[PDB]
Every structure is written in C-alpha cells, then in structure tokens.
Amino acid sequence: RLLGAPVPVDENDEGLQRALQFAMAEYNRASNDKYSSRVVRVISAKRQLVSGIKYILQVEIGRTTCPKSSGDLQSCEFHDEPEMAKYTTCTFVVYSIPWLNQIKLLESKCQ
C-alpha cells in the first residue's frame, strides 16, 4: 500500500541486470577461487526507491569451468560434477546513487 517500500520489479529490468551484473562481478573479485561464478537463475528480486535505488536479490550461484574473466564475461559453463559446482544461494543488496554516478554492495551473504 505504502510509499517507499520494497517492490517486486521484473527479471528483465535493465536497471536490475546492471545491478546484478555489478554484484556478481564484485564477487568473483572478492572471491579467492580461481574459477569465476556466475548466476543460475534469479529467485526473488525487489527494488526499493530511496535516496537513489536499492535492489534486493535472491539468486542461485554456481561455479563455472572458467578463469576470472581473463577471458570475457562472457558465458562459460558450470562444472560438471556438483561438488566442484558447489551450487548455493546468495542475497545481494546493491545501492545506486546515479546522480552521483556511484554504486555499492551493501550486503552479500550466501548460504
């Protein structure tokens, strides 16, 4: 009913893609694993309007048979054996302030 509360927002939301893209890219970089990950699917994403835009992602991540982009980024493939693919779920919280051309990663905790 409410002003300023988190809203659904569709999966193909260009603004979201960019939000996710950033999140993931940031990750692989924070990760120490020599294999880059990447999203299997977007479970539940919500966008809240504030002093800028805030996104809340629920996605399933997986390990691919690829290097840290030193490649492209660009779609490899996930590891064939589910134990190297170490599938899991993460929740990202991105915060963009466009009129300041900046963007952050407020929270990124995985299962």
Place this chain on the structure above:
Amino acid sequence: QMNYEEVIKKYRGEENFDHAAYDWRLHSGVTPVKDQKNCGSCWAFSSIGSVESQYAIRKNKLITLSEQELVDCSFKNYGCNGGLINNAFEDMIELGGICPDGDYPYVSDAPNLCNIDRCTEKYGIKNYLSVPDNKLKEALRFLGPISISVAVSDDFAFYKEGIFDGECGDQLNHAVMLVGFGMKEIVNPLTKKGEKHYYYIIKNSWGQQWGERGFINIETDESGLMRKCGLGTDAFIPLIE
C-alpha cells in the same frame, strides 16, 4: 479529518490570487532540504517538512523536527520499509509532538530503538486536512506547503533542471512536498512566439545535490488541475493553530 471548504474559508475568505505563480521559498515557508539516504522514509520527511513549514509561516519560528523519532516511534507505519503520510500525521497527534532533530538525530537504516522522552519540548499538530485534487493551487496559496505522493520513474531520479515532464512512474510510490507553483515564458522555436509554461515546485528529500538544489519543477496548467504523475492524489497538510 476536517473539511476543506470550511478551513479554506477562514484562511482565504475573499483575497483573490494569481494562479500564475507563488513560491513559499520566498515567503519564509520552506525549511532546508534534508536527505533520507539509504532508507525508505520519504513519508516521514514529507510530513515533518510540512509541519516545520507551518511553524515558520504561522509561529514565525524556524525549527527542524526529528524524522528519526517518527521513523522509530510510528507504529502505524513501517519505518525504513515504507509508510503513508496520513499515518505519519496520525501518530504525531498520538505521540503528542515530535522532538527537534537536534536532540533526536537521523541515522536512517541504522538499528535504533524508539524513545520519546528524549528532548525538553516537543512540536506537534492539532490535526490535518486532506486537499481535493482540484484545489492544490488554492491550498498552497492560503494554507501552505502540501505533503503529497507522486509516481516516480527513472527519468525522474535523473532530473537535473528545468520544468520536468519526462515519463512518470507506474504507480504512486514516493512522498514529497509541494512548495509552490511557477510560470516561465518560452519562445516556441517553430512559431517563434513565446508560450506560457506553468509548473509546480516540489521539495524532495534526496539531498541538495539532486535536481535544482534538492527541488524539481513539474509541468502543469494555469489552473493547476494537470497533475503529472498523479502528483497530489494524496495531499495532506497539518494544522498547528
């Protein structure tokens, strides 16, 4: 909870006015713009801004109230997860005034338990009234700044200057303040004759870097019945005297 027709009567009476332009920013009716930051508390900034404006206009006093207190203590709303303007005012009445933001600082999303007895004296309202979607200009002119809802889009969050008329949002989602209406002559580059472009003046809560020093202009007609982005489908204004 009051009746517009009865209220506007005592504040307007005869005093006819010019629908072209009037800006409270030039009549001691608008307090400094603030920033909600990472937290969805526009509903509070909008509300409180309206009451600070009422004090500067009716009491001649310049105070800045605490939207934190309102965010923490308004059990009608949902703090940083949204809220409604009229719920805000509602609770102000129950709480019996809000503290100056000098004693109850804003901290946005940071965990914070509510505490009322945190200042020497509180500032509140007597009640609030709702404004008809065809009386905004009148309302603004004799009653003062109005707390309104509006549907915002990306084209909005990217506003820089001038009288905006870009794409609106999907549904009402943001809370702002209506601090007046203006009018600019602009020579049509094709007919080469100047045309009159009317607009509303809105005070946002995203800081001073956004838009024209925190404000934004919205396209409208001379009567102000044209409410772009449904701006004003929700219009409230607090009364303190």
